[PDB]
Design a protein around this ligand. Sequence first.
Ligand SMILES: *SCCNC(=O)c1ccccc1
Ligand SMILES: [Zn+2]
Length: 257
Amino acid sequence: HHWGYGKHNGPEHWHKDFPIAKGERQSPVDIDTHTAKYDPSLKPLSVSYDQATSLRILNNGCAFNVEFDDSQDKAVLKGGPLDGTYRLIQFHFHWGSLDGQGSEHTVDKKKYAAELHLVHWNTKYGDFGKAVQQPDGLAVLGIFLKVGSAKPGLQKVVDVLDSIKTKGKSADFTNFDPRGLLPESLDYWTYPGSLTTPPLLECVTWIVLKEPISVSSEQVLKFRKLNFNGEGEPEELMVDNWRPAQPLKNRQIKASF
Ligand SMILES: *SCCNC(=O)c1ccccc1
Ligand SMILES: [Zn+2]
């Protein structure tokens, strides 16, 4: 794909091939905590990951995806703003070249060192590619990363990056438990938005957790050793793969707390 994160193919250029980039419900956005409103109508959030079945980790040239078996209801997200059930298909991260940047969402303009996206699709639509064509097709659980204490549940991921350094490399990644990536609190903000990479489809109910997880400097440093390029090509570090905040336009961010 032509698009990327650089001066010549980055976020400011995406609109020429994906005009929806200048659309009415684009992501990420800045979350202004003073204007987000508590919504008592929100039902309790349900993150049911006990039977999660991970498969593989892939360096796709832009980030790395950990993929799950979504053939059945094994890891699902329910409740909150959501109706019906949403199946986990993959997670990935966005991160920075420095600790003061890397997240996509911001909180009162605050940028975190990274941001985890747990991507889920609405089972009523039967497969992922159909769901992304629906305004309520996806639900993405967003979790901020700050640098501090190591996150033990992340270390298996960090441990395998060595084996997928370059674009197109994949590795077995079975028996990984995403519950180890969750903070204590499931207090969130929610708004309707989009994929944050091309094709930028406006199909996501965003659920962004208030509580960040802490990871260590050594953990984040290993993220930054990945490569955008393919094997045997000149090295370009995989850093700053985040889209900046987009205009909120006619949307309201709701708080669960
Ligand atoms: S989403 C990132 C897409 N790939 C690149 O922008 C790139 C730049 C330089 C070397 C390899 C790949
Ligand atoms: Zn993402």
